Design a protein around this nucleic acid. Structure first.
Lengths: 144, 77, 67, 182
RNA sequence: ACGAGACUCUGGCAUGCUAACUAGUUACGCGACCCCGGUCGGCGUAACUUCUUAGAGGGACAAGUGGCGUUCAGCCACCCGAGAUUGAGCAAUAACAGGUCUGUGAUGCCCUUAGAUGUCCGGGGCUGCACGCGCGCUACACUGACUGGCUCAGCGUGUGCCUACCCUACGCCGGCAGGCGCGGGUAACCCGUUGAACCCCAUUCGUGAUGGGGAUCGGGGAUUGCAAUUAUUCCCCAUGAACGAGGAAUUCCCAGUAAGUGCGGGUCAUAAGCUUGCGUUGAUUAAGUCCCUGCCCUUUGUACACACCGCCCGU
RNA sequence: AGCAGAGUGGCGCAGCGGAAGCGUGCUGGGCCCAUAACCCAGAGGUCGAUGGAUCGAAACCAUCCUCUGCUACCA
């Protein structure tokens, strides 16, 4: 129990990123780019895994079920308003992206804005603020 | 001026368990802070070990609080 | 140095005016307890009362003015 | 791994030391004696200069070492009062040379210690006692009795092997003295 | 004679006075639960002002005692005592080349007056960034962060003339921001006994730029308005940067005070990091000085008087 | 053509195993009613280059380059 179990995996290699095993499973999975604190509790509530265990002693079948909940969260009855990427301009699907679709889709959206020549794209290309705030007094780390 | 970044173990290895079971009930004041300092473990891990020792009956309760708890050894007589 | 001066404790008799550059010091008239006839003046920092006994590390100096 | 340079835990009065300054306070300033295992010291504000200063960091220069003289020490309590005003200009070169010999002896013995893999406070003090403090007490000089001993022992292995520390550790120390001290 | 004082408002008490179904208290009956007695901001009605509301009067004056003082003005400590220095309002002569012609159908002179410096419509701008400065907000954590439960206020405001735009209990739908038919208040009656926050208790976290910190940025959904793009605002999930208690210097304050913490009003169709009020928790230090920065009075000095930020000598 | 010194912030310089500083120049802030003096902070560094010893060199090793101190066209 409180004694370290056998084959206690220290470093977890999940989705070509580095994950510590010493952290709580509700917080060690938050180190993956794209997933945060709030959506982590839902995933470990759909899967029958308690929140009182560390990430370093879980095994292949439960972490494989959690990876299935990562990749296909829709048919495990996760509500549609809980997602980060909804109502796509390319195909119109509800999906959750985990750092690869997230990074390449953010890059594709930024080049889409730069190609479409909207002023949001021009401000992202120039390297300024887009949400419409004052630049006169702040943003002093822009350029030398 | 040595840094010595502490890397506390998240669970007990072999030597920590019997070191605790032989030395912690032989100390005057027991709190999870001084257990984490002497035995280089985590704060919550010390709390779980102290709850186990309280359930075993080798430690008496003094006062409980949401900030810290106070534990002491048994009388040697 | 090489000499341990024994600590003597003295009680005030009358408070004088407040000395110092900013007026933070005070002149007091202390008296010794091993022989209650001797009265010297010392510089004190802080509020003092009448009948307030003070500890003295040395018993040889005399009180100087604001400078 | 670190310890004191010489065998004395705290230096005597009227002794020159080179000290590393750490922070500046109101009544004094917090420093660290690099040759006495970074113990707490105090330099006085009026003792920094004999003439009128214009700023505190004219003579503070946080992070750079300086030369001081111990005015009053307390061996039982661990307090050393330092002095900056009472120093001669001719003492700086000799203090720097003594610190150079002490720091190269400490670096050579630290290298030999990490080769020999002896990581303990008491064992490291025993290695210092069997390596440098024995010849320091033999030559009756706190610092000047060591660097001349390594300079002689670089050419005299019989003088090198006079201390009965070990065999393989003695060979490693002789190799380090031959390679470094040339 | 003016100024100070004197005067007014507010706080601090009075079981004495006047009074209350738009404020309650105490008794009585009924009803509900439990083990003979407790709870009811449940229902209803016989006295009363103990709580509340606000009117008139009272009370503190150096009044007493012991000292200091020319024993004169006054000062110090103590007892009885709700207070033996509560806070604000008003605030003199003289002048400033102080600010306001963008508060005014208060205003002299000047400019302009039909291709207008009047006026109106549509769009934009006042927000645009190598950089510097001021007022402020959030933090740099374990005197803590998150999650549940327990639990306590006071100032206020509210359906407007052209002027349409109010505050809200209650029921359903939806995670939420929100939406519809329903009832009250033109106000001590309704929101409302304003179930406020900080605090209190119990888990989770364990010195790790970490579950601190929430900047930047992507996608989606509602509200206001004719109209949001240079995101009005709000909500949901992601994104998690700097920042490890801050150099020279400098601001405010001494008692319910600083500080922490939230709630009202002003702007308001949409609306507070500002301001003005209010309440809760609640300290450290000091009863002094003229050293710094300045102020009041007397004496003295002056080659100054648009007045030392003055005047003035020489290459 | 031969032997030695120096190679470090725009400029001059200290340094030799645990490790980018000094004086000066520039920029900004404070102090003051303002300026000059005074104080604070920062930018600015292949430490001339090559390969190697060493856990680790701007320094140790061999070479070259640039400017100087002495011989000078020595057939």
């Amino acid at each position: 129990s409180l004694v370290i179990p056998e084959k206690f995996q220290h470093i977890l290699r999940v989705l070509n990123t580095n994950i510590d095993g010493r952290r709580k499973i509700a917080f060690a999975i938050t180190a993956i780019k794209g997933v945060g604190r709030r959506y982590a509790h839902v995933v470990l509530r759909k899967a029958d895994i308690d929140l009182t265990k560390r990430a370093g002693e879980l095994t292949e079948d439960e972490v494989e079920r959690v990876i299935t909940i990562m990749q296909n969260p829709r048919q495990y009855k996760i509500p549609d308003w809980f997602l980060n990427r909804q109502k796509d301009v390319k195909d119109g699907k509800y999906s959750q992206v985990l750092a690869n679709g997230l990074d390449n889709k953010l890059r594709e959206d930024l080049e889409r804005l730069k190609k479409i020549r909207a002023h949001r794209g021009l401000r992202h290309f120039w390297g300024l603020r887009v949400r419409g705030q004052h630049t006169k007094t702040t943003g002093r780390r822009g350029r030398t | 001026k040595v840094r010595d970044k502490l890397n506390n173990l998240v669970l007990f290895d072999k030597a920590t368990y019997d070191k605790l079971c032989k030395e912690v009930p032989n100390y005057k004041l027991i709190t999870p802070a001084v257990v984490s300092e002497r035995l280089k473990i985590r704060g919550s891990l010390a709390r779980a070990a102290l709850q186990e020792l309280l359930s075993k009956g080798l430690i008496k309760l003094v006062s409980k609080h949401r900030a810290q708890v106070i534990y002491t050894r048994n009388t040697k007589g | 140095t090489s000499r341990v001066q024994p600590i003597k404790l003295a009680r005030v008799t009358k408070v004088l005016g407040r000395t110092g550059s900013q007026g933070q010091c005070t002149q007091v008239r202390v008296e010794f307890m091993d022989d209650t006839s001797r009265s010297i003046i010392r510089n004190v920092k802080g509020p003092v009362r009448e009948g307030d006994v003070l500890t003295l590390l040395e018993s040889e100096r005399e009180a100087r003015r604001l400078r | 791994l670190s310890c004191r340079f010489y065998q004395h835990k705290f230096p005597e009065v009227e002794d020159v030391v080179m000290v590393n300054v750490r922070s500046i306070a109101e009544m004094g300033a917090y420093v660290s004696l690099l040759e006495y295992n970074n113990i707490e010291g105090m330099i006085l504000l009026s003792e920094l200069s004999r003439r009128r200063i214009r700023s505190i960091n004219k003579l503070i220069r946080i992070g750079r070492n300086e030369c001081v003289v111990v005015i009053r020490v307390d061996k039982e309590k661990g307090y050393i009062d330092l002095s900056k005003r009472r120093v001669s200009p001719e003492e700086a070169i000799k203090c720097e040379d003594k610190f150079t010999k002490s720091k190269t002896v400490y670096s050579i013995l630290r290298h030999v210690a990490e080769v020999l893999e002896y990581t303990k406070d008491e064992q490291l003090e025993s290695l210092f006692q069997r390596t440098a403090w024995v010849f320091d007490d033999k030559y009756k000089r706190p610092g000047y009795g060591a660097y001349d001993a390594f300079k002689h022992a670089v050419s005299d292995p019989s003088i090198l092997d006079s201390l009965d520390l070990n065999e393989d550790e003695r060979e490693v120390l002789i190799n380090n003295i031959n390679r470094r001290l040339t």
